Design a protein around this motif. Sequence first.
Motif, short mmCIF file in Angstrom:
data_model
loop_
_atom_site.label_atom_id
_atom_site.label_comp_id
_atom_site.label_asym_id
_atom_site.label_seq_id
_atom_site.Cartn_x
_atom_site.Cartn_y
_atom_site.Cartn_z
N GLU A 10 10.09 8.29 13.41
CA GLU A 10 10.40 7.98 12.02
C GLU A 10 11.44 8.92 11.40
N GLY A 11 12.19 8.42 10.42
CA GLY A 11 13.06 9.26 9.62
C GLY A 11 14.53 8.89 9.68
N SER A 12 15.37 9.70 9.04
CA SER A 12 16.82 9.56 9.17
C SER A 12 17.24 9.86 10.60
N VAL A 44 23.59 5.23 18.62
CA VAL A 44 23.67 6.18 17.51
C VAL A 44 22.74 7.36 17.75
N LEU A 45 21.56 7.07 18.29
CA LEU A 45 20.56 8.09 18.57
C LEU A 45 21.05 9.03 19.67
N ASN A 58 17.51 -1.45 12.11
CA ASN A 58 18.83 -1.99 11.79
C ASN A 58 19.47 -1.30 10.59
N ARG A 59 18.67 -1.01 9.57
CA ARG A 59 19.18 -0.31 8.40
C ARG A 59 19.56 1.13 8.75
N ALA A 60 18.86 1.71 9.72
CA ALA A 60 19.18 3.06 10.19
C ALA A 60 20.60 3.13 10.77
N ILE A 61 21.02 2.04 11.41
CA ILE A 61 22.39 1.93 11.90
C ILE A 61 23.34 1.86 10.72
N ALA A 86 23.72 5.24 8.91
CA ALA A 86 23.96 6.44 9.70
C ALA A 86 25.21 7.14 9.18
N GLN A 87 25.11 8.44 8.92
CA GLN A 87 26.28 9.23 8.54
C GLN A 87 26.83 9.96 9.76
#
Length: 272
Positions: A52-54, A85-86, A185-188, A191-192
């Motif tokens: 979980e998280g950013s 991304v991860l 999907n929103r995490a993508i 993503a900064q």
Amino acid sequence: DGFVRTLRARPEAGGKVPVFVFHPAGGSTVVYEPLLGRLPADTPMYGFERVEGSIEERAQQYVPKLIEMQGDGPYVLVGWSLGGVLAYACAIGLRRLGKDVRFVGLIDAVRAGEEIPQTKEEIRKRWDRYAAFAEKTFNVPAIPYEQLEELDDEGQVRFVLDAVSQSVQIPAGIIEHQRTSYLDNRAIDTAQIQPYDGHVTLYMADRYHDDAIMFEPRYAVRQPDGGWGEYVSDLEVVPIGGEHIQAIDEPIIAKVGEHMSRALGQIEADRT
Ligand SMILES: CCOC(=O)c1c(-c2ccccc2)oc2ccc(O)c(CN3CCOCC3)c12
């Protein structure tokens, strides 16, 4: 176990450099089995599942486990979808702690062709869009924008889900899968991306699939560098064609695997 899945265990001592793969949006690392079949024999592979998280917060959990498993390096980090991304986030983390990262593989982890605003206005537009689709597919009110605008993505979906149950009756497994898929999907989207000074290989398909574009039309456009050029100076692009959803499976994964196997061999040779 935990959030680490063993797809192929490394031997007790020595052996080849392991490949670390990271889960995709709404999925587990079992999707990397076809890739595993196209990598050299006795290539160990470990999959990192959802936490979980950013992105940075997720990487803060992954990196200590990576170092526990592989120490100084060398690190081979790979990911399709959110996993890309991860993988990239972990590379930045590992390099920052002085570790040896030699390969980051993004399997069609393509940024939207136009940047996605993290604004209240975008929140309003997003839920307006979602509402309209809901009307059509479920054959069915005002949107409380003020409450939504104060919440983060997890708070937002939790709020909408709660309001829905107040008729409406959806089995927990379907809700939870839609919930985690949505948030991944929103995490993508949010993503900064930070700059990374190592070699990144981007396996690039032609386009996102239709369902992805319906959710966020800005993914209808891809830049040639997939949006990674400004953050990564040492960037290689390997075109694979087809669609985003096809990129992880046969036969397209064979192209990814042949290229990636060549990279791994150079790593094994340089060690010797
Ligand atoms: C079937 C494809 O659905 C999705 O990709 C998305 C989902 C979703 C919902 C339920 C079940 C499965 C997926 O939620 C999203 C939220 C924002 C957003 O930009 C996207 C579009 N994505 C964003 C990341 O890049 C690929 C497209 C999605």
